[PDB]
Amino acid sequence: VTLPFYPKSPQSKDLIKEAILDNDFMKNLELSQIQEIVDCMYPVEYGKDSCIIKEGDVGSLVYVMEDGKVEVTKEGVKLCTMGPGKVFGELAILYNCTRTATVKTLVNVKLWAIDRQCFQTIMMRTGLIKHTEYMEFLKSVPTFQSLPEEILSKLADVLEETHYENGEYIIRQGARGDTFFIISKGTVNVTREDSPSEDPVFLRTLGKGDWFGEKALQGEDVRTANVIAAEAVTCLVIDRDSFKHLIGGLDDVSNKAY
Amino acid sequence: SHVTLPFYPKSPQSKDLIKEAILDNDFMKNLELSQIQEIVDCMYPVEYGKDSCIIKEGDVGSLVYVMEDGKVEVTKEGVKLCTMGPGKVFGELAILYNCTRTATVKTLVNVKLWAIDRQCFQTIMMRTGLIKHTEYMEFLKSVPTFQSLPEEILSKLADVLEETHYENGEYIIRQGARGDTFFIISKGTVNVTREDSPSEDPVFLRTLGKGDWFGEKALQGEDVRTANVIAAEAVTCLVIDRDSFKHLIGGLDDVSNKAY
Numbered sequence: 477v478t479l480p481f482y483p484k485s486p487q488s489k490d491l492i493k494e495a496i497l498d499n500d501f502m503k504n505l506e507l508s509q510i511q512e513i514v515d516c517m518y519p520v521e522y523g524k525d526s527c528i529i530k531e532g533d534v535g536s537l538v539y540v541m542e543d544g545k546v547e548v549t550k551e552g553v554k555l556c557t558m559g560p561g562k563v564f565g566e567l568a569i570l571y572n573c574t575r576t577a578t579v580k581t582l583v584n585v586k587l588w589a590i591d592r593q594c595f596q597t598i599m600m601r602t603g604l605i606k607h608t609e610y611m612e613f614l615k616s617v618p619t620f621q622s623l624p625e626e627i628l629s630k631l632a633d634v635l636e637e638t639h640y641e642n643g644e645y646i647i648r649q650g651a652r653g654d655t656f657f658i659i660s661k662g663t664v665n666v667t668r669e670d671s672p673s674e675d676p677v678f679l680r681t682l683g684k685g686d687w688f689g690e691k692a693l694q695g696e697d698v699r700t701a702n703v704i705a706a707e708a709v710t711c712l713v714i715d716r717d718s719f720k721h722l723i724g725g726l727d728d729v730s731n732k733a734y
Numbered sequence: 735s736h737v738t739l740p741f742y743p744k745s746p747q748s749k750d751l752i753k754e755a756i757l758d759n760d761f762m763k764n765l766e767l768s769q770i771q772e773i774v775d776c777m778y779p780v781e782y783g784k785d786s787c788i789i790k791e792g793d794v795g796s797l798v799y800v801m802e803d804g805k806v807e808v809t810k811e812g813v814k815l816c817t818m819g820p821g822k823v824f825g826e827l828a829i830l831y832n833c834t835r836t837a838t839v840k841t842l843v844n845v846k847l848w849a850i851d852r853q854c855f856q857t858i859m860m861r862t863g864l865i866k867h868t869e870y871m872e873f874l875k876s877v878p879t880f881q882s883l884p885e886e887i888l889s890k891l892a893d894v895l896e897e898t899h900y901e902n903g904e905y906i907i908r909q910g911a912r913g914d915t916f917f918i919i920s921k922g923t924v925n926v927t928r929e930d931s932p933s934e935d936p937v938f939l940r941t942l943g944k945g946d947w948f949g950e951k952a953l954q955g956e957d958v959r960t961a962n963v964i965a966a967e968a969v970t971c972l973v974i975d976r977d978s979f980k981h982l983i984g985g986l987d988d989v990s991n992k993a994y
């Protein structure tokens with residue numbers, strides 16, 4: 477789930493993005509995917525008179541040329557030459573076939589390359605798939621599985637993923653609140669101080685699929701307890717208005733008692 | 735070269751069901767029409783009884799399904815995701831995205847499915863207009879007469895050429911007939927014959943094949959064909975209208991000054 481990263485100059489990052497936006501087979505990727513491809517590519521060089529791609533071979537890498545010149549042949553027929561700012565080697569990866577042509581260096585070249593597995597991983601990181609994963613998660617939460625699909629979908633549309641370090645206060649008692657939290661990862665501790673000048677008392681531990689932060693949205697806008705990450709925690713979070721329109725009605729949430 | 739996909743004859747009602755199911759699927763509705771058609775024709779029938787597991791999450795994906803009758807249940811790690819009825823695609827994610835099955839699919843009743851194998855799906859995914867256009871380009875470049883034409887002109891040729899198929903024995907061109915088209919042979923072979931008068935039998939002139947062309951003479955004189963061109967085996971020509979011929983190919987010395 478975690479991709480390789482290679483640091484690049486803005487000029488390089490722009491060259492690659494423009495190369496992709498110029499390529500007829502890839503120009504319609506979502507922007508976030510282009511961005512991920514951009515950061516993922518690692519640098520590769522070849523000297524003059526080298527063969528980068530042999531037709532018939534297994535394709536593994538997709539290239540963007542930053543510097544140099546290559547010649548593209550197929551069955552001995554010259555197809556074209558390509559200069560900087562062009563993608564090549566994407567067909568074998570996009571279409572799961574062998575290399576459809578041969579690419580040779582005419583000079584020393586400087587390429588950026590991404591391997592097949594990274595590319596395929598990124599191809600699946602679309603808005604529609606992220607949305608679907610949010611839906612699948614929500615359906616796993618008993619409070620929300622029973623909701624109509626349209627409302628789950630509306631929820632999935634607005635859900636924000638936030639992360640908390642161990643010991644981090646997700647919620648402090650006594651402050652206003654504007655967020656409702658669903659735990660997708662890890663555990664939290666809930667504590668409360670009854671009077672001022674006192675140490676907070678432990679109430680309970682919540683984990684994956686549990687939720688919190690409704691009290692300040694239902695009633696007075698003051699947090700009634702502390703919620704502290706007890707390990708590395710991920711929450712799916714909902715702003716006050718979304719809560720009100722989409723979730724505020726639910727009996728299990730509205731009439732929650734402790 | 736090219737693979738031939740299997741054809742499975744289906745009722746009109748089924749073909750429409752499949753077509754609609756794809757166009758209703760968010761991961762597939764943006765396929766070209768030609769691709770959706772090809773999927774339609776190459777899906778084959780498969781049935782399952784009540785309480786069968788069609789797809790297990792984690793497995794390598796092989797087939798994409800379209801349901802015509804019945805109801806299936808979709809779960810992931812035991813979480814119920816949905817039920818699906820007729821007119822729905824399932825099993826496309828593993829194949830589209832080269833991952834393992836992302837969920838489990840089980841039947842609730844007897845089901846009637848249409849299925850497409852991964853060999854076909856992979857073939858069809860690559861049959862786009864753009865890929866076809868590029869194949870046209872690569873072919874023209876293999877023909878020395880059309881190689882050295884600028885890229886802009888080859889691209890225009892690919893835009894307007896018509897790929898046409900001919901039966902064995904078919905007169906692609908009859909001597910004496912009016913003509914408006916130029917032909918480039920992309921596949922197969924033709925025989926060229928000519929008769930001195932129409933009350934005489936034609937004599938053999940020559941045999942042409944892939945990368946050869948014909949039909950230029952009637953575009954350069956009065957539009958009358960000066961010989962017969964007859965398909966020998968299965969023949970494919972890239973066919974070019976008169977105006978496109980004049981603007982794009984007519985200039986070429988090899989074509990203009992072709993002598994026989």
Ligand SMILES: Nc1nc2c(ncn2[C@@H]2O[C@@H]3COP(=O)(O)O[C@H]3[C@H]2O)c(=O)[nH]1
Pocket residue numbers: 529535548550555556563564565566567568569574575576577578579868871872
């Ligand atoms: N088949 C083909 N490839 C080309 C052409 N122009 C440059 N290329 C690149 O050369 C590459 C060969 O490896 P790939 O088939 O994976 O991807 C190809 C393209 O990205 C062309 O006109 N035809």
Ligand SMILES: Nc1nc2c(ncn2[C@@H]2O[C@@H]3COP(=O)(O)O[C@H]3[C@H]2O)c(=O)[nH]1
Pocket residue numbers: 647653666679680687688689690691692693698699700701702703734
């Ligand atoms: N008042 C109270 N809040 C709790 C308890 N256990 C979990 N919580 C959560 O801790 C949260 C503090 O922020 P909110 O008061 O807005 O909403 C609260 C609840 O959702 C409990 O026993 N008492």
Ligand SMILES: Nc1nc2c(ncn2[C@@H]2O[C@@H]3COP(=O)(O)O[C@H]3[C@H]2O)c(=O)[nH]1
Pocket residue numbers: 608611612789795808810815816823824825826827828829834835836837838839
């Ligand atoms: N991951 C996922 N698959 C679903 C869902 N609804 C129905 N499906 C189908 O279940 C199938 C499992 O095999 P695939 O992962 O190949 O493709 C999947 C879909 O076509 C859903 O909400 N999530």
Ligand SMILES: Nc1nc2c(ncn2[C@@H]2O[C@@H]3COP(=O)(O)O[C@H]3[C@H]2O)c(=O)[nH]1
Pocket residue numbers: 907913926939940947948949950951952953958959960961962963994
């Ligand atoms: N007149 C003539 N045409 C030929 C000969 N060999 C192949 N051809 C082709 O057959 C075609 C008949 O249609 P066209 O006269 O338009 O153009 C002709 C040529 O392109 C030949 O020896 N004589």
